[PDB]
Amino acid sequence: GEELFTGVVPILVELDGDVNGHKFSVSGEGEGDATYGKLTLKFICTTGKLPVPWPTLVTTLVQCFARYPDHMKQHDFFKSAMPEGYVQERTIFFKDDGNYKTRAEVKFEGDTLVNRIELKGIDFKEDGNILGHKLEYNAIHGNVYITADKQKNGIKANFGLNCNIEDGSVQLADHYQQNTPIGDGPVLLPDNHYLSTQSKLSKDPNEKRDHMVLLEFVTAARMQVADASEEELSECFRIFDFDGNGFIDREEFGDIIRLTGEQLTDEDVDEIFGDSDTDKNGRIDFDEFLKMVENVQPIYPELMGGVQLADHYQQNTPIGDGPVLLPDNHYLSYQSKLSKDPNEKRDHMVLLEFVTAAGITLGKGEELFTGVVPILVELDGDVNGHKFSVRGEGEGDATNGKLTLKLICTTGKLPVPWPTLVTTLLMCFARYPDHMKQHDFFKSAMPEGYVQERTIFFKDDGNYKTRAEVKFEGDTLVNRIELKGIDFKEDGNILGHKLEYNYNSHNVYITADKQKNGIKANFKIRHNIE
Ligand SMILES: [Ca+2]
Ligand SMILES: [Ca+2]
């Protein structure tokens, strides 16, 4: 016990850095107010031009200023180590680039809180997104998951931080953190929890040097099921239970836990599954899931926090009278990269989709997709009376389950966010493994093609109804769509444009519909809000 953080405390930050031999120094000053979770800092590069983007360094450049609510004061390791302070060490893995390693001492000198850091970066690409300065200068946010490290009298933390790339895509930085106290005195060791962190980056008009003004909020939180509605907990469970049978099995848990962060091995996954399946029946029931949400703090905040759910109900029917393949149950694993063509002036979306068939253990018109195949996409839509059109082109590569599209709004400004149309705007380009080729309805209906219909239910907002014909005209695969949307809120997340420009991974669970000579599927899409 000793909260030197009752009122407003002055901060000093000093960083000495070396990334791929490019050395630099940063100095910062400002103030922290713990009782709100508020930091205000200005940082100067004192060595001229900073050889990495400012937002890569935000996390390195004072978690002692977090606001711990009254029910969590006994979980604040950071303040408990003051005034002698703590060592903070990290490794930060930039996906498809290099890594930073950092060591800092955070402590009081007089009445000023000081963060002193050495940072070493290696194996960066000289023209990747970091050394090539291809990151936007925006705002970053995330949740820092804290667990006790009893053996060092400290804490560990892990989190994935996303920063926007200039092309509209998203750069992942995987953080592994360790804190240990400098002095010998007692410290608070916490239950599992997280810091909700928002960072706002701006410039000072009156500063010539390379620099960053930072406004940051940090709030401690701990997920408790008692703080969520039956509806919210049901939804969360259904993300996991994507085959709809009412229980979570090991294959399901595998895929869906890996959406909470990139940091889990097959063994971590076996361990959490084993610990959550309290009666050892090989499935996680609803009650077991409730306790697993408190035990594994990332589950709810990462799957459902700041997320607009979109419930998809889908049906596919052949256009021709020819024989088709009606599959056994299975799913399509989807990953999606959204970006922007820097030379297109119209409102548009570049969409890259990776699609592979899974979920059956090894335990005719396919020939048309051997084959890089050109695509045409045409959508005409009406949402709450707002008319629009999209027209696009690209290519599908079935054997790598890859497709690329550029999609243009030809009616000016698109009155809904582009991500709400991703599922509407080519399942025939899935890669079906060799043991599942007899389960690929989509290719089997080509060249005459299939009708794809859906209803999409945006939680606490309106719905889209869609009908598309997917077929070959010549050597071009064509998706033609009508969409009708009703009962949207004019300032909800769709018509108010409050959805981020990125996309999560999802599994589409497919079952046969023998009575229609087709298939159906239902899946939940998770759209990030802001
Ligand atoms: Ca299930
Ligand atoms: Ca069980």
Residue numbers in the entry: 5 to 65, 69 to 370, 386 to 447, 451 to 555
Text taken from the publication that reported this structure:
The recently developed FRET-based calcium sensor Twitch-2B uses a minimal calcium-binding moiety derived from the C-terminal globular domain of toadfish Troponin C (TnC) fused between the mCerulean3 donor and a circular permutation of the yellow fluorescent protein Venus (cpVenuscd), which acts as the acceptor. Large-scale diversification and screening, predominantly of the residues linking the minimal calcium-binding domain and the fluorescent proteins, has been used to optimize FRET changes in this indicator. Here, we report the high-resolution x-ray structure of the fluorescent proteins mCerulean3 and cpVenus within the biosensor Twitch-2B, as they undergo FRET and characterize the dynamics of this biosensor with B02-dependent paramagnetic nuclear magnetic resonance at 900 MHz and 1.1 GHz. We find that interdomain dynamics limits the FRET effect and show that a rigidification of the sensor further enhances FRET.
Here, we present the crystal structure of Twitch-2B. It depicts the calcium-bound state and is, to our knowledge, the first crystal structure of any fluorescent protein FRET biosensor. We solved the structure at a resolution of 2.5 Å. The interfaces of the minimal calcium-binding domain with mCerulean3 and cpVenuscd are also relatively small, covering only 257 and 351 Å2, respectively (see below). The linker between mCerulean3 and the calcium-binding domain (V232ADA) forms a 310 helix, which is tightly held in place by backbone hydrogen bonds from V232 and S236 in mCerulean3 to E301 and E239 of the calcium-binding domain. Next, the linker between the calcium-binding domain and cpVenuscd (P305IYPEL) forms one and a half α-helical turns, the backbone carbonyls of E309 and L310 forming hydrogen bonds to the side chain of R551 of cpVenuscd. With these parameters, using the Förster equation, E=R06/(R06+r6), the theoretical FRET efficiency, E, of Twitch-2B was determined to be 0.98.
